[PDB]
């Protein structure tokens, strides 16, 4: 049995650290809900 | 508890208490990814949340009602992943989405790597609206993870 517990509000953080790049990928989505690269 | 916000999804079928994912409560509906719960019933303290809508292909599921989140990446702005990693506090990470280009159209994607139990963490726009959930994506040449910004359809 799974249960849920609250972890915070849904809010923009002005003082957030910024990371991660922005790749453009060509992908396929199969019937099982999985993305694959092409 | 049905207060709006971000929630951990926990199980005890394994060792100790394990976080299997994350979800968003909004307007009395709990939203998460299909692969987190596989459509299973959930417990909130003394109450019970049962599934209302789900789709494996989208990898989303809603509890107590229909999908309520309808905001979308404006295209241009940077976004924030409100990551809730297992055993760690909720943390905002700001990033500029990349793009998954499919035969069916383009989807924003975030190149951020978190443990599997972070699946379901909301991505938000600057005005605070949830524009999708994290945790369904690909692993690319270098070996790091890129998650789609996975959003449902309201009404
Ligand atoms: N860094 C990662 N790769 N994952 C992160 C978590 C990813 C975010 C959570 N979301 C998922 O786990 C979904 C659940 C299925 C959604 C249902 N449709 N899975 C995915 O999106 C993709 C889809 C495959 C597409 C190819 N056809 N599956 C994987 O990446 C498997 C995997 C391959 C390699 C590894 C770990 C996992 C290597 N370990 C690590 O690097 C660090 C170990 C811990 N950190 C992780 O595990």
Swiss-Prot record, chain A:
It is found in: Host endoplasmic reticulum membrane. Residues 8-30 are annotated as: Disordered. Residues 1-38 are cytoplasmic. It is a multi-pass membrane protein. Residues 4-38 are annotated as: Interacts with and activates NS3 protease. Required cofactor for the serine protease function of NS3. Forms a heterodimer with serine protease NS3. May form homooligomers. Interacts with human SPCS1. Interacts with non-structural protein 2A. The central disordered region transitions to ordered by binding to NS3. This is Serine protease subunit NS2B.
